[PDB]
Enzyme design. Structure first.
Site, mmCIF file in Angstrom:
data_model
loop_
_atom_site.group_PDB
_atom_site.id
_atom_site.type_symbol
_atom_site.label_atom_id
_atom_site.label_comp_id
_atom_site.label_asym_id
_atom_site.label_seq_id
_atom_site.Cartn_x
_atom_site.Cartn_y
_atom_site.Cartn_z
ATOM 1 N N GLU A 113 41.690 -78.409 22.065
ATOM 2 C CA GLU A 113 42.300 -77.766 20.977
ATOM 3 C C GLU A 113 43.595 -78.770 20.631
ATOM 4 O O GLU A 113 43.575 -79.115 19.451
ATOM 5 C CB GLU A 113 42.943 -76.313 21.192
ATOM 6 C CG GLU A 113 44.170 -76.136 21.919
ATOM 7 C CD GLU A 113 44.345 -74.634 22.335
ATOM 8 O OE1 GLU A 113 43.969 -73.668 21.371
ATOM 9 O OE2 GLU A 113 44.865 -74.356 23.423
ATOM 10 N N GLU A 160 49.287 -67.422 28.166
ATOM 11 C CA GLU A 160 48.702 -66.708 27.165
ATOM 12 C C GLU A 160 47.197 -66.782 26.912
ATOM 13 O O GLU A 160 46.514 -65.902 26.460
ATOM 14 C CB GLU A 160 49.435 -67.194 25.663
ATOM 15 C CG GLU A 160 49.432 -66.505 24.463
ATOM 16 C CD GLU A 160 48.172 -66.782 23.782
ATOM 17 O OE1 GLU A 160 47.520 -68.063 23.928
ATOM 18 O OE2 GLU A 160 47.636 -65.977 22.952
ATOM 19 N N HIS A 161 46.618 -68.153 27.303
ATOM 20 C CA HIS A 161 45.131 -68.104 27.333
ATOM 21 C C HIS A 161 44.472 -67.303 28.614
ATOM 22 O O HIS A 161 43.476 -66.763 28.346
ATOM 23 C CB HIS A 161 44.747 -69.513 27.425
ATOM 24 C CG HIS A 161 44.957 -70.480 26.064
ATOM 25 N ND1 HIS A 161 46.037 -70.513 25.805
ATOM 26 C CD2 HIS A 161 43.836 -70.910 25.472
ATOM 27 C CE1 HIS A 161 45.997 -71.252 24.345
ATOM 28 N NE2 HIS A 161 44.721 -71.434 24.336
#
Lengths: 54, 403
Positions: B128, B51-52
């Site tokens: 993150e 997804e990144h």
């Protein structure tokens, strides 16, 4: 035997109470032990872990 | 007369649904039945890391030129991943409908994962996560999922453990991509100013290439850290799943519960494929911790025992007013459409939702609440100064009443 009876007219009645007491304790001790081990299992399975943020 | 969501699955298996609205702006998305539940602990962050990587360039559109295209029409590009579903959606104008679909086609297939990028996105993801711990409610809900679904693929988080994040390679990703991106497990959903026949023709033109025991566990997890100012506590029981209709009734009950004591009360009904978490996540000061609980458990037992018609009517009105979730906005509807086709296999119209709401009365609400809340073993997740948070016997005893 008679003098014995005299000194304890309840000898017979008691022993019947003791037999009922042994049967009731043989029923009740493992069941109360099982309830205690239920309510203490939670902790006795608790797993602690130290996770310093490091 | 709810606008129907016309659906046109492809032979490959790509269901293509769309709903037309006045809005000259249209939101088009791809939903994939692929999440952290389909990962096998050796690729626990593959969906998140893909997804990144999915917006960093494809084979046909190498690098930032791709996102230059989605800047050129002024469109917005979003993606998200849950434990069961992955979504890539674009909000754009109506007249830019073809190129957007073509863009989405690249994002699902022909995507390019650059090794250079892999290291950069690893540092992004790693960092993150290294700071994600900051968000408490996310930590508490991850702890609740872990302790409620221990030993299953539903315990593991969407992001995965830092370990896997560092240890991931193109080929692994390629696998997850080539394994969980099948055409029969994909929905092309469109909401707003779109024509269904044009969208079906665009899906035939591009995207026509896509290749063709869950268990709850009651457990007390407690992350004690007394330096935090506030404590977050989530208590849940097992939910029914997506396809079980009494969810609707549970939604009413959740509504009735609402939020009355310590601040930050809330209620959730998270649903996965024949499972879920139904409960509450409050957050509070040291003392309120217990009472709130006590408070909270009392409300649940009241809904199991003493539900009246007035609060049921209020909960039904709140749920209907919640159908606004569907609304008319391109994004929300599209999203809703996306799940409908992945979970139910069809788009449930709002009239059917209204019928299932109006058939709910107080008797079946307290019956279903007694089925799901009364005398059930909960999953508890606490984070913060949680010493006065009661242990499992007190919560379990608060899950029923002696009267």
């Amino acid at each position: 035997t008679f003098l014995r009876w005299a000194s304890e007219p309840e000898h017979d009645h008691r022993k019947r109470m003791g037999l009922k007491m042994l049967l009731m304790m043989g029923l009740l001790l493992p069941l109360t032990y099982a309830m205690k081990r239920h309510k203490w299992s939670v902790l006795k399975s608790r797993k602690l872990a130290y996770r310093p943020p490091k | 007369s709810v606008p129907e969501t016309q659906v046109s699955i492809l032979d490959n298996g790509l269901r293509v649904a769309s709903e037309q609205s006045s809005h000259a702006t249209c939101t088009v998305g791809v939903w994939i039945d692929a999440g952290s539940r389909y990962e096998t602990e050796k690729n626990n962050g593959a969906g998140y890391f893909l997804e990144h990587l999915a917006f960093k360039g494809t084979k046909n559109r190498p690098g930032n030129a791709l996102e230059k295209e989605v800047e050129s029409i002024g469109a917005h590009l979003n993606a998200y991943s849950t434990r069961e579903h992955t979504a890539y959606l674009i909000k754009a104008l109506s007249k830019d409908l073809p190129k957007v679909v073509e863009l989405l086609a690249d994002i699902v297939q022909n995507s390019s994962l650059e090794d250079s990028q892999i290291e950069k996105e690893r540092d992004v993801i790693l960092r993150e996560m290294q700071e994600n711990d900051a968000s408490m409610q996310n930590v508490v809900f991850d702890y609740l999922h872990a302790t409620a679904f221990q030993g299953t693929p539903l315990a593991q988080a969407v992001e995965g453990p830092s370990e896997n994040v560092r240890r991931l390679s193109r080929t692994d990703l390629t696998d997850y991509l080539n394994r969980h991106y099948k055409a029969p497990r994909m929905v092309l959903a469109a909401a707003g100013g779109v024509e269904h026949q044009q969208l079906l023709d665009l899906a035939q033109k591009h995207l026509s290439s896509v290749s063709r025991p869950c268990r709850f566990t009651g457990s007390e997890i407690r992350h004690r850290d007394d330096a935090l100012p506030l404590a977050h506590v989530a208590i849940a029981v097992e939910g029914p799943g997506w396809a079980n209709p009494d969810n609707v009734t549970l939604q009413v009950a959740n509504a009735i519960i609402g939020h009355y004591l310590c601040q930050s009360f809330q209620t959730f009904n998270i649903s996965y494929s024949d499972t879920g978490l139904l409960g509450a996540h409050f957050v509070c000061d040291a003392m309120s911790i217990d009472d709130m609980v006590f408070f909270l458990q009392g409300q649940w037992m009241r809904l199991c025992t003493s539900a009246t018609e007035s609060e049921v009517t209020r909960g039904k009105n709140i749920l209907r007013n919640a159908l606004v979730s569907h609304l008319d906005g391109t994004t929300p509807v599209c999203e809703d459409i996306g799940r409908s086709l992945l979970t139910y296999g069809r788009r449930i119209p709002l009239a059917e939702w209204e019928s299932r709401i109006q058939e709910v009365d107080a008797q079946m609400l307290r019956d279903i609440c007694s089925k799901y809340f009364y005398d059930q073993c909960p999953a508890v997740a606490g984070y913060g100064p949680i010493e006065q948070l009661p242990d499992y016997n007190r919560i379990r005893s608060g899950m029923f009443w002696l009267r």
